[PDB]
Amino acid sequence: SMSYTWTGALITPCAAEESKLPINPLSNSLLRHHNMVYATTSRSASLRQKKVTFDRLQVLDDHYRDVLKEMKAKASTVKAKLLSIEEACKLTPPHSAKSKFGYGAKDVRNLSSRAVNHIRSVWEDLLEDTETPIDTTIMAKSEVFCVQRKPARLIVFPDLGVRVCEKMALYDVVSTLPQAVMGSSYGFQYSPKQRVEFLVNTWKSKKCPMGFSYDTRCFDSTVTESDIRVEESIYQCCDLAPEARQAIRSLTERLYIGGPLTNSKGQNCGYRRCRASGVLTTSCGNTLTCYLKATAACRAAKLQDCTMLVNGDDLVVICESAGTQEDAAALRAFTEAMTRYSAPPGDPPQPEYDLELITSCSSNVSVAHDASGKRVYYLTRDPTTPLARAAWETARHTPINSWLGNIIMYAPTLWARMILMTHFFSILLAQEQLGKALDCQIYGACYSIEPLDLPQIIERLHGLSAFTLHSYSPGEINRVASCLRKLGVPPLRTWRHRARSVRAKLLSQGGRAAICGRYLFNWAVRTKLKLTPIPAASQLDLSGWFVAGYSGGDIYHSLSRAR
Ligand SMILES: Nc1cc(Cn2c(C(=O)O)c(-c3ccc[nH]c3=O)c3cc(Cl)ccc32)ccn1
């Protein structure tokens, strides 16, 4: 069936759209080649529509059926709870898109009578009606990139009342079921330090390792109605409250498998028969589907002693080599099996014999040295997109601050320490905003974090070595330096000068600011300050941080204020 059908009505914006990076003094202190930075808009939506619209031909086999039964046997151990309306309301982001039915996210969070009444009516409708397709809005996503242009990605999501109901029925399922089913292969259970430990240990556990990343082209579009019902067959193995069983059944048939698409003007846009990017089950569903297809494909390809690491549509496989020619042929056999399963590749996969050459979750393993000279593996990535987005976020107030998430997740990197920490701490200190909570995303969930709490967060996630790494690899240094020349970012010597300046100001303030000066900027001086465990670090409640993926799932994970 066709992933989409279109009526001809346009994918429309709801307000004015900015595509060019503004010429602003603060963003220009970070990145001078402003014309290289752009944001996608609804203007390129028709280009994306062409790419995502295609017929799917899916052929299942015994390997697929065998893996599915094994996955279902593991899912059968799960007991999932139905969330109360209050619990589901507290998981709604404060700036989540308002309902078309006269209430918004603030009303949901405050448990307003109108919001609660409407949520109750939507819930009852899911219990009573098993068939009426649920309306969804389609919008072009606004995302920032560096040139060499990508067309806008499309986001498809149901009304706020429906999203609250999805949490009630499925938040516990999507949070617990993936690790029960996939075990150590489930990527979202790991902090970046745990992910690098898993990759390194997996790589070293093979006699002669071979690894590869597998990129599916337009994954959400490749997801069939059969795949979405298969995913539901796994959810149904949970012990569930009867109302949750009915809501999952109704949501699968009315929303997850497909439905009508409406633009921002209220016009009928078309019909979807593939994964919606903006529902609670997107991450969990994509992860399970990718794992199922890939596990079965490994068996079809006769790949030996396979270990997979899956995060949504992102897949990395580490296995035992059978020799270069044999591995090349087995990888073609894997690709052929994935294609039959309706998961064809974007770029054909390449066998890799060096762990640092694999790019998975847009990241690669690299090595640096701690204060004692001991080798420390850590995850890095090309800094082009993080820097382009940090420049955008400096010039415009954006709902999500990717710079903050990048500092948290890539804290040990040369680029996050020398550039992002230096730039943002300098600006925030000049604005007396170091203590102001900002929103960022970790594994798709929204968190409200104060920049002053970064030292303890980083220590918990990455260890104290995140503040002591040095002797970065020549390859990593060259990649960063080349990216700075390309984007017109001042060189690392300028960043060291700026860091010494902000470090002195932070130390002079005492309190939490001085902890930031001591730990975050110890790299900038020869006269190192002693770094001991931060007391606040052991007291941090990081429950929920690295449990599951929630991209597109409208999840907020910071504490709710009592009423
Ligand atoms: N490209 C992907 C990435 C993922 C998993 N993943 C995410 C993620 O965005 O989910 C982040 C991440 C980076 C910055 C801010 N916040 C974050 O969560 C991240 C960082 C490392 Cl080191 C490893 C994996 C990571 C899943 C699917 N496709």
- Both structure tokens of 434: 């170091």
Largest CA distance in the chain: 69
d(CA 79, CA 245): 12
Q: Taking each helix axis from N to C terminus, what angle separates 422-430 and 402-409, rounded to the nearest 10 degrees?
A: 130
Whether residue 325 is found in the same domain as residue 399: no
Residue nearest ligand 1's atom 20 by CA: 409
- Both structure tokens of 484: 């700075």
Q: Is the CB of 386 under 6 A from ligand 1?
A: no
Q: Which residues does 241 contact at the CB level (< 8 Å), separation at least 6?
A: 81, 82
> Which among 79, 77, 129, 121 is positioned nearest to 246, based on CA atoms?
129
Please note each residue after which the chain is broken, C-to-N distance over 2.5 A, or write none.
148
Q: Please identify which residue in the block is written with the tokens 């109360």.
A: 84
Count of structural domains within the chain: 2
Residue nearest ligand 1's atom 17 by CA: 442
Q: How far is the CA of 533 from the centre of ligand 1 (A)?
A: 26
d(CA 304, CA 319): 6
Q: Hey, which bits of 20-164 come out as E strands?
A: 37-39, 136-140, 144-146, 154-157
Whether residue 317 is found in the same domain as residue 386: no
* Amino acid in the structure at residue 97: A
Ligand 1 atom with least separation from CA of 188: 5
SS3 assignment, position 121: helix
449 touches 545 (CB < 8 A): no
Resolution (A): 1.8
Whether residue 549 is found in the same domain as residue 473: yes
For this PDB entry, the determination method is X-ray
Whether residue 323 is found in the same domain as residue 375: no
d(CA 69, CA 87): 33
Half-sphere exposure of 135 (CA within 13 A, CB side): 15
Judge residue 23's burial from the number of C-beta atoms within 10 Å of its C-beta, 0-12 exposed, 13-18 middle, 19 or more buried.
exposed
Question: Which of 360, 378, 406 finishes a domain?
Answer: 360
Q: Please identify which residue in the block is written with the tokens 């709710």.
A: 560
Q: How far is the CA of 476 from the centre of ligand 1 (A)?
A: 19
Q: How far is the CA of 422 from the centre of ligand 1 (A)?
A: 22
Helix (H) or strand (E) holding 367: strand 364-369
486 touches 479 (CB < 8 A): no
Q: Is the CB of 41 under 6 A from ligand 1?
A: no
276 touches 256 (CB < 8 A): yes
- Helix H segments across 396-473? 402-409, 414-415, 422-430, 454-462
248 touches 240 (CB < 8 A): yes
| Total Cβ atoms within 10 A of residue 14 | 12
> Which among 396, 401, 424 is positioned nearest to 29, based on CA atoms?
424
Report the alpha-carbon angle 324-184-92, nearest 5.
Answer: 125
Whether residue 355 is found in the same domain as residue 392: no
Q: Is the CB of 444 under 6 A from ligand 1?
A: yes
Whether residue 393 is found in the same domain as residue 315: no
- Both structure tokens of 494: 């300028």
Whether residue 462 is found in the same domain as residue 348: no
d(CA 227, CA 419): 43
Question: Which of 331, 360, 389 finishes a domain?
Answer: 360
d(CA 555, CA 547): 13
Residue nearest ligand 1's atom 15 by CA: 405
**Polymer length of the chain:** 563
Q: How far is the CA of 443 from the centre of ligand 1 (A)?
A: 6
300 touches 339 (CB < 8 A): no
Q: Please identify which residue in the block is written with the tokens 């799960």.
A: 78
Q: Which residues does 328 contact at the CB level (< 8 Å), separation at least 6?
A: 351
- Both structure tokens of 418: 């020398």
Give 76-111 as a DSSP string: TT-B-PPPPHHHHHHTS-TTPPPPTTS--HHHHHTT
Whether residue 398 is found in the same domain as residue 356: no
Mutate to test the pocket of ligand 1, among 287, 362, 408, 461 (most ligand atoms within 8 A of CB): 362
Q: Please identify which residue in the block is written with the tokens 């944001």.
A: 39
SS3 assignment, position 199: helix
Q: Is 313 annotated as ligand-binding?
A: yes
Q: How far is the CA of 510 from the centre of ligand 1 (A)?
A: 33
534 touches 455 (CB < 8 A): yes
Q: Please identify which residue in the block is written with the tokens 């979807």.
A: 272
Q: Is 220 annotated as ligand-binding?
A: no
Q: How far is the CA of 442 from the centre of ligand 1 (A)?
A: 7
Ligand 1 atom with least separation from CA of 444: 10
Ligand 1 atom with least separation from CA of 549: 10
Domain that holds residue 88: 1-360
Q: Is 215 annotated as ligand-binding?
A: yes
Ligand 1 atom with least separation from CA of 312: 27
Question: Which of 329, 360, 391 finishes a domain?
Answer: 360
d(CA 439, CA 360): 25
Whether residue 126 is found in the same domain as residue 108: yes
Q: How far is the CA of 444 from the centre of ligand 1 (A)?
A: 8
272 touches 258 (CB < 8 A): yes
- Both structure tokens of 443: 């594994």
Q: Hey, which bits of 167-219 come out as E strands?
A: 209-214
Give 459-501 as a DSSP string: HHHH-GGGGT-BS--HHHHHHHHHHHHHHTPPPHHHHHHHHHH
Mutate to test the pocket of ligand 1, among 200, 311, 449 (most ligand atoms within 8 A of CB): 311
> Which among 489, 347, 381, 403 is positioned nearest to 144, based on CA atoms?
403
Region of 318 on the Ramachandran plot (φ > 0 left; ψ -120 to 50 alpha; else beta) = beta
Residue nearest ligand 1's atom 1 by CA: 361
Residue nearest ligand 1's atom 2 by CA: 361
Q: How far is the CA of 128 from the centre of ligand 1 (A)?
A: 38
Whether residue 399 is found in the same domain as residue 341: no
Residue nearest ligand 1's atom 9 by CA: 443
Whether residue 429 is found in the same domain as residue 288: no
273 touches 225 (CB < 8 A): yes
Whether residue 424 is found in the same domain as residue 472: yes
d(CA 80, CA 318): 32
Q: Is the CB of 405 under 6 A from ligand 1?
A: yes
Q: What is the DSSP letter of 562?
A: P
Q: Is the CB of 406 under 6 A from ligand 1?
A: yes
